Amino acid sequence: YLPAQQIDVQSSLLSDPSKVAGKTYDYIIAGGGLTGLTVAAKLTENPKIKVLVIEKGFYESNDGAIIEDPNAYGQIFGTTVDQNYLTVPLINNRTNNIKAGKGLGGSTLINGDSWTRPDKVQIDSWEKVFGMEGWNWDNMFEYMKKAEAARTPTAAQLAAGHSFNATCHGTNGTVQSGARDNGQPWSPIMKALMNTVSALGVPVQQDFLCGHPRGVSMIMNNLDENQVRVDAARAWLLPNYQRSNLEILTGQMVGKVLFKQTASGPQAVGVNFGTNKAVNFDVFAKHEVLLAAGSAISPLILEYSGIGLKSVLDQANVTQLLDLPVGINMQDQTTTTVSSRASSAGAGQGQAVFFANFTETFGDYAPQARDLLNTKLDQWAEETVARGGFHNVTALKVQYENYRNWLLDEDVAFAELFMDTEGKINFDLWDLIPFTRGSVHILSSDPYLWQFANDPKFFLNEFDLLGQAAASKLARDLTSQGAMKEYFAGETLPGYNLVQNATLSQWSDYVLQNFRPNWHAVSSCSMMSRELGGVVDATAKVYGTQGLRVIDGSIPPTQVSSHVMTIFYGMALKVADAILDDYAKSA
Amino acid sequence: YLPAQQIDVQSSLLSDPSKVAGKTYDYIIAGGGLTGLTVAAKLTENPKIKVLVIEKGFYESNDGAIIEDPNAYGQIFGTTVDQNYLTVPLINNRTNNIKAGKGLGGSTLINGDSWTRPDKVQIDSWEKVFGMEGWNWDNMFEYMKKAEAARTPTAAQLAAGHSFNATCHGTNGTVQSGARDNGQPWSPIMKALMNTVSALGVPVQQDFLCGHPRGVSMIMNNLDENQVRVDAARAWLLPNYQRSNLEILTGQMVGKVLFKQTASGPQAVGVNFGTNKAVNFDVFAKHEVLLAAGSAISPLILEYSGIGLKSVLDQANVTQLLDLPVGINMQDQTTTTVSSRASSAGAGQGQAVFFANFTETFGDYAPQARDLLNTKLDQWAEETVARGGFHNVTALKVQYENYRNWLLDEDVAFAELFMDTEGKINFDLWDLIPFTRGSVHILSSDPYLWQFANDPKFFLNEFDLLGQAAASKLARDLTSQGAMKEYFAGETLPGYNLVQNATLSQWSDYVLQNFRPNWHAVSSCSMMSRELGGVVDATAKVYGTQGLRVIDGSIPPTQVSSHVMTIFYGMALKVADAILDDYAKSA
């Protein structure tokens, strides 16, 4: 990594709210994150469309290594670029922190840069199970390829374990992708891990952009040729910020959507934005207001605007405009870490990802886990609804059956074991397919206080705890197994904190105390049929409203066995097309 | 509590940075918290003194119950009024959150409202040991009384356990103080606790405003007659915000102090403030720049400005202007909670505080603890300096000896067991007098990124851990002892998480995993002689600089066996007098 030249984009953007207050744009986008900027860029390709992006943070892509270098991952946490949202006290009786980016590019500023794609069956379920017409793998694959420009791996990258299936990578898109390569010798552990699991009959070197992410592979990252993080601002704003029809207001928060009443429901006419209950401004949209503030916030903006569950709104003292199941169905994953020291021979760079299916994760407990899936769905659905994770047991059962189908019938990756080397055998791992459903709701009426109860309800579903415990056990087992054993130089985490012969039950206890949110919450404004409990339709329009869409990570109706940037970019592009279709239909 | 109609002070304050950018004020106060507002109010009593307060947050005193009602304590955590600073990963390998207020009044907006005063010997040591002229109990007692307007407890409050030594309470000051009374029947547990410890020879009903806070008493709160939290904005800004010479810029952060080089060192000439590396402005001070951004932030502002330890500034890429031990010596306390359910008879409202001295805290381990204090000071001092908590072992040993003196010779309260009732026997407790010394340093040069390493170094000193373990055991033991037993309905925390017969060693392991910061960090810019490692002198001037003072919680050179609002108000008043003395000397 070399700190190259960075355009000071911020100095050409707006930071004075009085410059936009009371103005009228075609579209107002709340949140200049992944989806917000993608859509902003696509909308402003048409010179007649004036778009205002209101972003809480600022331009941070020129911050140097802490943002630009993928290898500095994590150092930005705790800075002003980290939203650092606080959850309610979780199952272990501690609040947890939600990492999320604050600044143009949102969480793409601070993420791990892992570039993989969901399983075809997961995206197909959006159309086939959730009724979202056109949201299927074939369509999304095209949009996902359209978003990226992949570079093929070098010889050393291939030898380290990379495997590139050229049919799955777009080569002409906006977001560059390629193998992370920090200049260090390649650790042999990625290959060792592949050799270990391939001896168990686990697929290896499947290209994770191809539709069936399974087994152990090295992955692409969203890095340019200079190994610079291609956050969404760099990809979509940097090239386009001089467009006169694209206005970016930084340092300001959208608090609520402004509506006018029509015969066909509330029509969004603008937003109230600002920084405080007494420092806020109205700004108007001729066409639509697009919420792209991230899955933790977009539901809140709706609730602050009077759209949400009456029970939530009443408690918050917000007059209800529309009853919609906003802020429920939220699905984040639980992450645990199993870390071991690698021998000197195992030193070097490299990450490998193991997308373990149901049986690989559960191993000898597979039969028992299968029995639970086959018999407890109704009970789990009832309990999830009872704790406020969802509102319609029948509709939730559909989701559970969908996940069950994936896990037992479709060989979908259940757990992701993310291995980092750099002198260790470090596994960050998470059960990808939670049965728990969480909630994210406002607690009071002033949007600028941002008083919310963000409750992912981790491990309130027993299967998620078992799944995480089994995945964690698997990481430990894999580390001192087969070819991996050669490089194993002692476990440090849990290390002495958990007996080496730990059973699934002991791992469960350990995991309950030592997990963190995966910070990949989705489905807080679920895009699914209204009858299934959706908040937004297939064009991301909030049901019962006009001129209002939620276009971010709040809308995926399911978790995916993948890193979400790819699908979110594809989703943002698809939604931009829908918005533009509507624009064209108004003359 | 009853929500009354509140004045919208925010609308009369500044939120546009362009309105102050480039102006010259007499004084610029970075941080409109407890000390910042107190000083700003005192300085602007003189109509010719133009003061600018730059506050990161806004006016929040009219937010309703979440701020105004002391009984809503903690609901504000996680909102925009909570700084929610992240520490580095602590001894338990978890980062922890630092609650701190963000808005006019700072942490007085979100605090527990406990109004108690330090021990006379602790304040006397500032002058006697640390060499800070005029900083002694007699002087501070008067200043502390001048800040407050106390109400005597009612008959019911007295019968519940209140006790007042009228000679210690100011009755004409600005911050009202009185018994919290939420209208509920008084729990009998405060009296039961007093009866329990009084059987053991522990003092009860000592007035904790009188100089020797010891034993179990009920305490005053900073509440007006309407039971409204008297935060510092309410007390000092609300009455005075129409002053034409008092300008408050909200929503902006001071990032660094601007200096002009003189013969006698750097002269502060103003500050750079704003919200981002590319969105910031300069504003100038004719007289002085006063840092009052809180003990977690003032040291950082100095470091961002080039004042601090070379090793820190080099790592952060900040050119050093002055080498001073900024951001070390930091002392926060560790808090643990021992919570038990109370029988129905113990129901009701009421808080009681046990200021436990050394022997009461350690009980049977007293002899062993005393041995540690008598023999390990030098070792601890070396180890504290080695881990970066301080820079001069000899000077640190002075602090250690001072603390040892307090504990062993002066009967100073060593641990505070803060009891809440309301259906429980809930003890939040902390060792008040830490031997550990933490650090708080910038990690990079952009102030607006706020990339820092806030490291309280909790439990890196063995005595602190022992002290916290012993205090925690004491809380458990007291709960089911003597008169307390009647109301004891079973422990819930640690409850099953720690065996009921837990030894001190088992408590230590427990405490290590289950503690939180007390959020009372002081001494990050210690007010002590330069030779002892001071950052500011007895008039709060940063050594080696002109026109620059640190006037907040960063400056107390020692922890105090008390809630700090009282002493911080007293300190701010004393510092205001020092500032005005200098103002007068410049014509």
Ligand SMILES: *[C@@H]1O[C@H](CO)[C@@H](O[C@@H]2O[C@H](CO)[C@@H](O[C@@H]3O[C@H](CO)[C@@H](O)[C@H](O[C@H]4O[C@H](CO)[C@@H](O)[C@H](O)[C@@H]4O[C@H]4O[C@H](CO)[C@@H](O)[C@H](O)[C@@H]4O)[C@@H]3O)[C@H](O)[C@H]2NC(C)=O)[C@H](O)[C@H]1NC(C)=O
């Ligand atoms: C906070 O986090 C830090 C950092 O992670 C924790 O500190 C690390 O703690 C781990 C232990 O949990 C420790 O790892 C040991 O390192 C030793 C080298 O100094 C190794 O000898 C040791 O290996 C043995 O134990 C492993 C774990 O059980 C086995 O996997 C391994 O094969 C080894 O087992 C052999 O030896 C043991 C002797 O204990 C014997 O009983 C076995 O049967 C077998 O013969 C560990 O790998 C790290 O060195 C620590 N330090 C750092 C910086 O990493 C700290 O514990 C955490 N604190 C809390 C409160 O959680």
Ligand SMILES: *[C@@H]1O[C@H](CO)[C@@H](O[C@@H]2O[C@H](CO)[C@@H](O[C@@H]3O[C@H](CO)[C@@H](O)[C@H](O[C@H]4O[C@H](CO)[C@@H](O)[C@H](O)[C@@H]4O[C@H]4O[C@H](CO)[C@@H](O)[C@H](O)[C@@H]4O)[C@@H]3O)[C@H](O)[C@H]2NC(C)=O)[C@H](O)[C@H]1NC(C)=O
């Ligand atoms: C997260 O926090 C929640 C909330 O605090 C935790 O849930 C609470 O957990 C505690 C236990 O740790 C539990 O308290 C028990 O409640 C029971 C009633 O429901 C009581 O019967 C029980 O009392 C016995 O145990 C206490 C603790 O040891 C003793 O102090 C007490 O005297 C009792 O012990 C006597 O009785 C038993 C048999 O009854 C005997 O064997 C003993 O030797 C002795 O004679 C506890 O008070 C709370 O009910 C839980 N729930 C709530 C809502 O508070 C949760 O565990 C935490 N989660 C994690 C992961 O840490």
Ligand SMILES: Cc1cc2nc3c(=O)[nH]c(=O)nc-3n(C[C@H](O)[C@H](O)[C@H](O)COP(=O)(O)OP(=O)(O)OC[C@H]3O[C@@H](n4cnc5c(N)ncnc54)[C@H](O)[C@@H]3O)c2cc1C
């Ligand atoms: C720690 C972490 C690691 C991750 N690692 C990976 C990875 O390795 N691979 C991967 O593919 N994905 C990863 N992700 C996920 C990916 O970054 C997110 O899914 C993606 O950025 C979500 O896009 P979005 O548009 O939904 O929201 P975001 O990108 O979060 O953007 C939302 C934007 O809204 C702004 N905002 C918030 N509130 C308001 C308001 N009230 N008004 C105006 N603006 C507001 C925020 O500042 C932000 O810029 C990671 C995310 C995190 C947090």
Ligand SMILES: Cc1cc2nc3c(=O)[nH]c(=O)nc-3n(C[C@H](O)[C@H](O)[C@H](O)COP(=O)(O)OP(=O)(O)OC[C@H]3O[C@@H](n4cnc5c(N)ncnc54)[C@H](O)[C@@H]3O)c2cc1C
């Ligand atoms: C959770 C909690 C509970 C507490 N309970 C009690 C109690 O019960 N009794 C008691 O006596 N004390 C209590 N305190 C302690 C008391 O509230 C604090 O000690 C006191 O407010 C510290 O005053 P200060 O002036 O140092 O800083 P603060 O009051 O914190 O004020 C600092 C101010 O600076 C602002 N600021 C921060 N960074 C910047 C920047 N870069 N530029 C401009 N402004 C900035 C902050 O927004 C804030 O308003 C508690 C504190 C906390 C956090």
Ligand SMILES: *[C@@H]1O[C@H](CO)[C@@H](O[C@@H]2O[C@H](CO)[C@@H](O)[C@H](O)[C@H]2NC(C)=O)[C@H](O)[C@H]1NC(C)=O
């Ligand atoms: C999960 O993938 C495994 C491959 O790793 C699938 O195949 C079975 O693998 C298990 C152990 O890994 C073996 O016991 C079986 O013998 C394998 N099958 C055959 C035909 O050999 C397994 O089917 C996948 N699970 C699901 C639910 O799809």
Ligand SMILES: *[C@@H]1O[C@H](CO)[C@@H](O[C@@H]2O[C@H](CO)[C@@H](O)[C@H](O)[C@H]2NC(C)=O)[C@H](O)[C@H]1NC(C)=O
């Ligand atoms: C801690 O306070 C205890 C009281 O709980 C002190 O003990 C009393 O000390 C006085 C002497 O000043 C004696 O007259 C009493 O008989 C003592 N006995 C007890 C156990 O009550 C104790 O001295 C204090 N400890 C320190 C270190 O000051």
Ligand SMILES: *[C@@H]1O[C@H](CO)[C@@H](O)[C@H](O)[C@H]1NC(C)=O
């Ligand atoms: C290659 O990609 C195609 C889709 O284009 C997919 O069908 C096939 O399974 C992929 N193979 C591997 C090994 O990734």
Ligand SMILES: *[C@@H]1O[C@H](CO)[C@@H](O)[C@H](O)[C@H]1NC(C)=O
């Ligand atoms: C509950 O969800 C099921 C499945 O979508 C649906 O058939 C039913 O209409 C929903 N119930 C109501 C009353 O909406």
Ligand SMILES: *[C@@H]1O[C@H](CO)[C@@H](O)[C@H](O)[C@H]1NC(C)=O
């Ligand atoms: C009463 O307060 C005075 C200080 O004003 C103090 O000197 C005296 O000791 C106090 N009395 C008791 C009993 O604490």
Ligand SMILES: *[C@@H]1O[C@H](CO)[C@@H](O)[C@H](O)[C@H]1NC(C)=O
């Ligand atoms: C170390 O501290 C001691 C005690 O204050 C002092 O005498 C000595 O001068 C200090 N520092 C230096 C620079 O040596």
